Amino acid sequence: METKDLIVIGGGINGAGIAADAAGRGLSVLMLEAQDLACATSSASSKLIHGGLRYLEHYEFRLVSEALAEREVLLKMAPHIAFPMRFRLPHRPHLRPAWMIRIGLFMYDHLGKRTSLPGSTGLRFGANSVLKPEIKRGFEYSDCWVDDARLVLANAQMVVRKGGEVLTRTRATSARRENGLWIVEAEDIDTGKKYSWQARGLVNATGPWVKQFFDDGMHLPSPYGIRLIKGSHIVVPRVHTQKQAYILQNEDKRIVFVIPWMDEFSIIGTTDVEYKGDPKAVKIEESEINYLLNVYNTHFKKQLSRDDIVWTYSGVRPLCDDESDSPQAITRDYTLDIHDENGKAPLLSVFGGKLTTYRKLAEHALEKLTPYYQGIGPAWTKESVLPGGAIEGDRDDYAARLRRRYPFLTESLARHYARTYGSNSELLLGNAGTVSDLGEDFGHEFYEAELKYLVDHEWVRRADDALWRRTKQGMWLNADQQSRVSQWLVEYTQQ
Ligand SMILES: Cc1cc2nc3c(=O)[nH]c(=O)nc-3n(C[C@H](O)[C@H](O)[C@H](O)COP(=O)(O)OP(=O)(O)OC[C@H]3O[C@@H](n4cnc5c(N)ncnc54)[C@H](O)[C@@H]3O)c2cc1C
Ligand SMILES: CCCCCCCCO[C@@H]1O[C@H](CO)[C@@H](O)[C@H](O)[C@H]1O
Ligand SMILES: CCCCCCCCO[C@@H]1O[C@H](CO)[C@@H](O)[C@H](O)[C@H]1O
Ligand SMILES: CCCCCCCCO[C@@H]1O[C@H](CO)[C@@H](O)[C@H](O)[C@H]1O
Ligand SMILES: CCCCCCCCO[C@@H]1O[C@H](CO)[C@@H](O)[C@H](O)[C@H]1O
Ligand SMILES: O=S(=O)(O)CCCNC(CO)(CO)CO
Ligand SMILES: O=C(O)[C@H](CO)OP(=O)(O)O
């Protein structure tokens, strides 16, 4: 023993969040991630902690109420990476009558417990707005932005903090019951180092891969189909200077967001495209671009073309197959399935599960796993504060506090540290007292002290883990800057 209580296969948000909860109820936990933390669906989201306004139409009150209540729990768990945002809904009476918006916005206000977040209001649009002349009315309400990939990272660190282990670049190849225990086989994707562990419990939280892990990894029947529903986002220099997001009603009845991103960009997403194939292959297609530019350009005065696009990303939603004919109508609710064999070796397996609802999901999963452990502590995460979160304030509150303590910090660098690392910033900065104490400037104030900290504390192994997942510095570093980051990581992860 050697025998872990629980193996979690999966390090997106649902695997990390399950493993974090388990470790904090006393279980020995190993979370296995085939590639990098959040390398798939959990870094390809719209980055919102939202209730799911559009899901009210489809009468999804269990999900929408749970997700609304979670916005505020998540704001306190991670105030370094999560924050309130306001969403502007332009009125399109030919699509949805005002009286209908007002009922939904009323429900959005009261279906979950809502202290901090303001309520909705009506809006008018003048000759001087960002929107087209003919659009005269709208609405405004609350929801939250989160740094998806950093929420995943925070949870992995919670695992380790609480005594668990987390292996990345380690692909589970098989899992089988023997003699009352799981035998989990995994393998290092680079070297080829084989591993084998026994555990009392197995979570299959492999997102879009959940059913193919049943088929190829376990030779067991999957309790559910998964529908893979691709969505893509485009990125442009910001379309306007407003702080608020816009949520646009399209002719097909879907909604599309224009979201301020990192003070310089806007994100426009997303799409619902039925998908077959390898979830790692997923990338935006021409018609997704055409579709997103269109709904933008029909609403807004400042027009965008294709040539304005600076970045795109794409991902596949692993949606519990409710056999719904239309991809936009398939449920965004999750399903968890627990099964033992002779009252021992449970298999908990995860189907669906928005980032918003992950802490709820993790909790229910441990609920179902309780019978098979001791011994096991109770629920606890609602009242936790994830690593990085111990700041109380943020928005220079923490960044100004840091520039105070570390006066050689530029205001941009302190904002970045505060909004990325939070309360882990002093750990990064160590014994630095000047800028040259930070080491090699890799570009855009991305210094060797940040990159080394990422390797030492954040499982960074390759340039992209650092530049696209733990941060979004890859938005500013040029091709040679990025390969120097890779070159450095080679030298340091030698050796
Ligand atoms: C376009 C889009 C926009 C979205 N926007 C939002 C939003 O705004 N708000 C919100 O709350 N949610 C949003 N979501 C939903 C959310 O992103 C997903 O539900 C969530 O990220 C899925 O996480 P997961 O852990 O279940 O899957 P993942 O963690 O992403 O997938 C499983 C992970 O485990 C690893 N893995 C897989 N198989 C193995 C194996 N065999 N062995 C070892 N490791 C393995 C992978 O390498 C993979 O990264 C969005 C989703 C999409 C697609
Ligand atoms: C009891 C009468 C039934 C009315 C259904 C209420 C749900 C309305 O939901 C509405 O539609 C869209 C998607 O949900 C959103 O864009 C709107 O803002 C939202 O209010
Ligand atoms: C006469 C215009 C009143 C409101 C100012 C902006 C116009 C767009 O608002 C309109 O108001 C209607 C009443 O006719 C609502 O029922 C509709 O949903 C909408 O078409
Ligand atoms: C937020 C107010 C309580 C909700 C009551 C539903 C009445 C909304 O009804 C709508 O009101 C709009 C603005 O007056 C009008 O433009 C529309 O014609 C009307 O359908
Ligand atoms: C089939 C789906 C349509 C059902 C809606 C009822 C039709 C009446 O239509 C609307 O109803 C609202 C409340 O019902 C009122 O506030 C509006 O003033 C009225 O225009
Ligand atoms: O700092 S934490 O303790 O929260 C996580 C530390 C992880 N360190 C690794 C360094 O090799 C990953 O970066 C692996 O244990
Ligand atoms: O653009 C979006 O938000 C869509 C549907 O309009 O998807 P989802 O609900 O999965 O995030």
Tab-separated table of N, CA and C in Angstrom, residues 403 406-414 417 428-429 431-442 444-450:
chain	number	residue	atom	x	y	z
A	403	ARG	N	2.750	45.607	-5.814
A	403	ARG	CA	3.615	46.660	-6.216
A	403	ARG	C	4.130	47.375	-4.968
A	406	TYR	N	6.694	44.852	-3.620
A	406	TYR	CA	7.775	44.601	-4.568
A	406	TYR	C	7.881	45.764	-5.544
A	407	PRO	N	8.404	46.929	-5.080
A	407	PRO	CA	8.344	48.230	-5.822
A	407	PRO	C	8.998	48.209	-7.210
A	408	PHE	N	9.878	47.249	-7.470
A	408	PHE	CA	10.442	47.072	-8.837
A	408	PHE	C	9.413	46.457	-9.836
A	409	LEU	N	8.258	46.017	-9.326
A	409	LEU	CA	7.196	45.543	-10.231
A	409	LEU	C	6.601	46.718	-10.988
A	410	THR	N	6.650	46.604	-12.303
A	410	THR	CA	5.841	47.371	-13.226
A	410	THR	C	4.348	47.184	-12.926
A	411	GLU	N	3.514	48.141	-13.296
A	411	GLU	CA	2.102	47.983	-13.018
A	411	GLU	C	1.511	46.869	-13.889
A	412	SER	N	1.986	46.691	-15.129
A	412	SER	CA	1.496	45.588	-15.966
A	412	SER	C	1.921	44.215	-15.334
A	413	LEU	N	3.201	44.060	-14.982
A	413	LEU	CA	3.687	42.820	-14.401
A	413	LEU	C	3.002	42.522	-13.090
A	414	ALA	N	2.739	43.524	-12.283
A	414	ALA	CA	2.058	43.214	-11.051
A	414	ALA	C	0.585	42.784	-11.312
A	417	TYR	N	0.914	39.048	-12.549
A	417	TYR	CA	1.114	38.180	-11.379
A	417	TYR	C	-0.133	38.063	-10.544
A	428	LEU	N	6.668	32.690	-6.396
A	428	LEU	CA	7.339	32.910	-7.672
A	428	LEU	C	8.525	33.878	-7.546
A	429	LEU	N	8.278	34.950	-6.831
A	429	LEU	CA	9.184	36.050	-6.783
A	429	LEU	C	10.325	35.698	-5.809
A	431	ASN	N	13.335	35.334	-3.506
A	431	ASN	CA	14.240	36.412	-2.982
A	431	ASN	C	14.618	37.564	-3.952
A	432	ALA	N	13.902	37.726	-5.084
A	432	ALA	CA	14.014	38.905	-6.008
A	432	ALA	C	13.800	40.248	-5.296
A	433	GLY	N	14.608	41.234	-5.663
A	433	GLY	CA	14.427	42.577	-5.143
A	433	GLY	C	14.671	43.616	-6.207
A	434	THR	N	15.139	43.171	-7.382
A	434	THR	CA	15.205	44.005	-8.577
A	434	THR	C	14.632	43.231	-9.792
A	435	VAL	N	14.351	43.937	-10.899
A	435	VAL	CA	14.033	43.313	-12.209
A	435	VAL	C	15.061	42.355	-12.770
A	436	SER	N	16.348	42.560	-12.538
A	436	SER	CA	17.298	41.636	-13.180
A	436	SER	C	17.407	40.365	-12.353
A	437	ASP	N	16.941	40.418	-11.102
A	437	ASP	CA	16.723	39.216	-10.292
A	437	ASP	C	15.710	38.262	-10.916
A	438	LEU	N	14.839	38.758	-11.796
A	438	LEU	CA	13.874	37.933	-12.539
A	438	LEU	C	14.524	37.094	-13.680
A	439	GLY	N	15.776	37.383	-14.085
A	439	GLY	CA	16.448	36.559	-15.107
A	439	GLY	C	16.019	36.959	-16.526
A	440	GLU	N	16.365	36.114	-17.508
A	440	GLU	CA	16.058	36.295	-18.910
A	440	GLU	C	14.648	36.780	-19.129
A	441	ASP	N	14.554	37.863	-19.888
A	441	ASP	CA	13.299	38.403	-20.369
A	441	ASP	C	13.063	37.594	-21.632
A	442	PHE	N	11.912	36.924	-21.700
A	442	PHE	CA	11.571	36.104	-22.861
A	442	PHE	C	10.665	36.909	-23.792
A	444	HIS	N	7.474	40.340	-23.545
A	444	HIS	CA	6.205	40.739	-22.912
A	444	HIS	C	6.252	40.521	-21.399
A	445	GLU	N	7.376	40.929	-20.752
A	445	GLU	CA	7.616	40.725	-19.291
A	445	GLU	C	7.356	39.300	-18.782
A	446	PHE	N	7.715	38.340	-19.615
A	446	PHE	CA	7.572	36.940	-19.270
A	446	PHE	C	8.999	36.508	-18.973
A	447	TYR	N	9.343	36.487	-17.691
A	447	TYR	CA	10.676	36.286	-17.231
A	447	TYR	C	10.937	34.893	-16.770
A	448	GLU	N	12.202	34.520	-16.813
A	448	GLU	CA	12.659	33.240	-16.357
A	448	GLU	C	12.155	32.811	-14.933
A	449	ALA	N	11.977	33.773	-14.015
A	449	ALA	CA	11.434	33.517	-12.670
A	449	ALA	C	9.994	33.000	-12.761
A	450	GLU	N	9.221	33.549	-13.718
A	450	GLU	CA	7.862	33.022	-13.978
A	450	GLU	C	7.936	31.626	-14.572
